[PDB]
Paper text:
Phosphotriesterase-like Lactonases (PLLs) are appealing candidates, being natural lactonases endowed with promiscuous phosphotriesterase activity. PTEs and PLLs belong to the amidohydrolase superfamily, and share the same (β/α)8 barrel topology. SsoPox exhibits high acyl-homoserine lactones and oxo-lactones hydrolysis abilities, and promiscuous, low phosphotriesterase activity. SsoPox is a very appealing candidate for the bioremediation of phosphotriesters because of its unique thermal stability, and its ability to resist aging, solvent and protease treatments.
Of them, the most active variants, αsA1 (C258L-I261F-W263A), αsA6 (F46L-C258A-W263M-I280T), αsB5 (V27A-I76T-Y97W-Y99F-L130P-L226V), αsC6 (L72I-Y99F-I122L-L228M-F229S-W263L), and αsD6 (V27A-Y97W-L228M-W263M) were subject to kinetic and structural characterization. Although the active sites of the improved variant structures superpose well onto the wt-structure, all selected mutants display altered loop 8 conformations. Changes are subtle for some of the variants (e.g. αsA1), but are large for others (e.g. αsC6). However, the active site cavities are larger for the mutants: most selected mutations replace residues with smaller ones: W263 is mutated into M/L/I, V27 into A, I76 into T, L130 into P, Y99 into F. Only two selected substitutions relate to bulkier side chains: Y97W and L228M. Interestingly, variants αsA6 and αsC6 exhibit enhanced lactonase activity against γ- and δ-lactones, while αsA1, αsB5 and αsD6 show reduced lactonase catalytic efficiencies.
Residue numbers in the entry:
A (entry chain A): 2 to 258, 279 to 314
B (entry chain C): 2 to 259, 277 to 314
Write the structure that this text describes.
C-alpha cells in the first residue's frame, strides 16, 4: 500500500500514529547547488535526527514529508534519517510553486507533467527505488494562476492512474484551497483523497467547514511555527471543530524547519476540554489511515 | 588576471580567439535535481567535447560560458570537458532570472547577494578551486523588476570589489539592455566592463549604437538561432555596424552549442564579412582585442 523511504511497503492499516505534514529539511535546489557553502549537511542531519527520535519517543510511528520540487526534496538525505532512526517516512512527488513553473515547462503539457509524478510513484525517486506515496501542490497569495492550475490538473491525472492521495498547500485567507478542491473534484478525484493544507491559519471557521463539508480533510498543520495565528487561537478552532463533529475530517501537524509542540501544548489542551483519547486517535491514526487507503 | 576552469590563471593579453557567450549545458536546477531520468549526461558530454573541439580547429582558444544560477551551472561538468578538449574555459557567477528570486532571497539583502558572487570570484565555485572570471545578470520581457534590479546592484558591488566584467542577458525589443547599463553605470561601473547581451536580435540599429556610444560592448551573440532574426538579417546589422566603425565595441557569439552550432560564424558570418570589405584586423579586433580589454 504505502511506500516508505528505506524500508519496504507497509499496509495502510499499520501506518500508526502519524504526523501528516512535516519537513525534514527545506531549500531552493538552485541555491544549494550553486552555493553549497551556505549549508551545513552535518548540522542539518543532526538536528533532524534529534527531532525525529524525540517524536518517536512520544509515540509517532510515521512522518509524511511533503517536500517536493521547489523546496528541495532529496531522497538520499531522507533514507539517511530513516536508517539513523527507524521512522516510517513517506516521501511524495509533485511541484511546489505559487506563480510560474520553471522554464523547462514552457510548451510542456499537463500530461507530460503528470508523467513526472507517475514516474516518481511507479519507477521511483531521483534514481532510487524509494517511491512517492502521494502528490503535493501549492497555491498561496497569488491565487490560482495558469501554471498553478496546470500543476493541480496533473495531480488529478496522477491520482487517477495511481490512486495515491494529494496534499495541498494553500493560503487560508484567499479561497485558494476551496479552488483546489473544486478543480480536483471536477476532474474526478475522490474528495476524500485530498488534504487541503494550512486551514489552521484562519479563525474563519465557516470557510474551513465549507471545505470539510465537500468531503476533503482540513489541515490544521502549522502548529508552533505560529507567525500566522498564535498557538492559542489554533488550539480553539481545533477544539471548536471537534465539538461540532468534524473530527473525521481533521488532520494536525507542524510544518517545521519543534516537531513535538502538539504533545506539549495541543494534545494536553484538548484533553482538558473533554476530548477523549478516541478523538485524538481518530485524528492521528484513523484519518491518516483512510486518507492512504 | 583571468581564472580558468581546470588550469592556472592566464594573462588578459593571452585569451586568443574568444567566443564570449557559449553554454556547454543548460538546465533548470530544480527539474534535474528532482527528475534526473529526463537527462542523459553521457550524451551531453560527447556533444560538449565534440562541439568544443570543432571550435578549436577554427582556432578558438578561449570560450566564456555564462551558465549561472537558474540555468544549471556545474563546474564539475565544465572541468570534465576541459580535460577532454584542452580549452581555456572561463566560468562565471551571478543570477539568471526574469521576475522573482528564489524563496531563499526573501527579505535578504543586496550585499548578502553580492557576497555569493564575491565568494565564487575570490574563494571558488561550488567549493572547488575554479574561480569565476565575470558576473552574469539577466532581464527580459518582464522588465526591470524589483528582484532583477537587486541582482544588478549585487553585480555592481562585485565589479567594484574584484573588477571582473559583467555580461548581461537582455531583451533587444524593450530597452532592458540599456537600463542594465544605466543602473550599473549609475552605481559607477565602468561602461567598458559591461557586455550587454542579445542586441543582435533586433533590426533597430539606432538602439544598438546608443549602448555602444555610452561605452559598453554590444552582444551580437545568438548566431544561428533563427527564431529571433535570421542569419542573413544579423550579418548586415553586423556589417553596417562595422562600416560605421563600431568594431571596437562589437562582440559576436552563438549562445549555445547544437543549421545552428558552436561554429556557424566560421562557415558563414566570417566569410560574409570578408567578401564585404572587412579585413583580418577588424575581426581580430572583435574576437581577440575586444575580449582582451573587457577582461582587463
Ligand atoms: Co541569454
Ligand atoms: Fe509544508
Ligand atoms: Fe546565453
Amino acid at each position: 500500500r504505502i511506500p516508505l523511504v528505506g524500508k519496504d511497503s507497509i499496509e495502510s492499516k499499520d501506518i500508526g500514529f502519524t504526523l501528516i505534514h512535516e519537513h525534514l529539511r527545506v531549500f531552493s535546489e538552485a541555491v544549494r547547488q550553486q552555493w553549497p557553502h551556505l549549508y551545513n549537511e552535518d548540522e542539518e542531519f543532526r538536528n533532524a535526527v534529534n527531532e525525529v527520535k524525540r517524536a518517536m519517543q512520544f509515540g509517532v510511528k510515521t512522518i509524511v514529508d511533503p517536500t517536493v520540487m521547489g523546496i528541495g526534496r532529496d531522497i538520499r538525505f531522507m533514507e539517511k534519517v530513516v536508517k539513523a532512526t527507524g521512522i516510517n517516512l513517506v516521501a511524495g512527488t509533485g511541484i511546489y510553486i505559487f506563480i510560474d513553473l520553471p522554464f523547462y515547462f514552457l510548451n510542456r503539457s499537463i500530461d507530460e507533467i503528470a508523467d513526472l509524478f507517475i514516474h516518481d510513484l511507479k519507477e521511483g525517486i531521483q534514481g532510487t527505488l524509494n517511491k512517492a506515496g502521494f502528490v503535493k501542490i501549492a497555491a498561496d497569495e497569488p491565487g490560482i494562476t495558469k501554471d498553478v492550475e496546470k500543476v493541480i490538473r496533473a495531480a488529478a491525472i496522477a491520482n487517477k492512474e495511481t490512486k495515491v492521495p494529494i496534499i495541498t498547500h494553500s493560503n487560508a485567507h484567499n479561497n485558494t484551497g476551496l479552488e483546489q478542491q473544486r478543480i480536483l473534484t471536477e476532474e474526478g478525484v475522490d474528495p476524500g483523497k485530498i488534504l487541503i493544507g494550512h486551514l489552521g491559519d484562519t479563525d474563519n471557521i465557516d470557510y474551513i467547514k465549507k471545505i470539510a463539508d465537500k468531503g476533503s480533510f482540513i489541515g490544521l498543520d502549522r502548529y508552533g511555527l505560529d507567525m500566522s495565528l498564535p498557538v492559542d487561537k489554533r488550539n480553539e478552532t481545533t477544539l471548536r471543530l471537534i465539538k461540532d463533529g468534524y473530527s473525521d475530517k481533521i488532520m494536525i501537524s507542524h510544518d517545521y524547519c519543534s516537531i513535538t509542540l502538539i504533545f506539549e501544548d495541543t494534545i494536553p489542551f484538548l484533553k482538558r476540554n473533554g476530548v477523549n483519547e478516541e478523538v485524538i486517535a481518530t485524528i492521528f491514526k484513523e484519518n491518516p489511515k483512510k486518507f492512504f487507503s
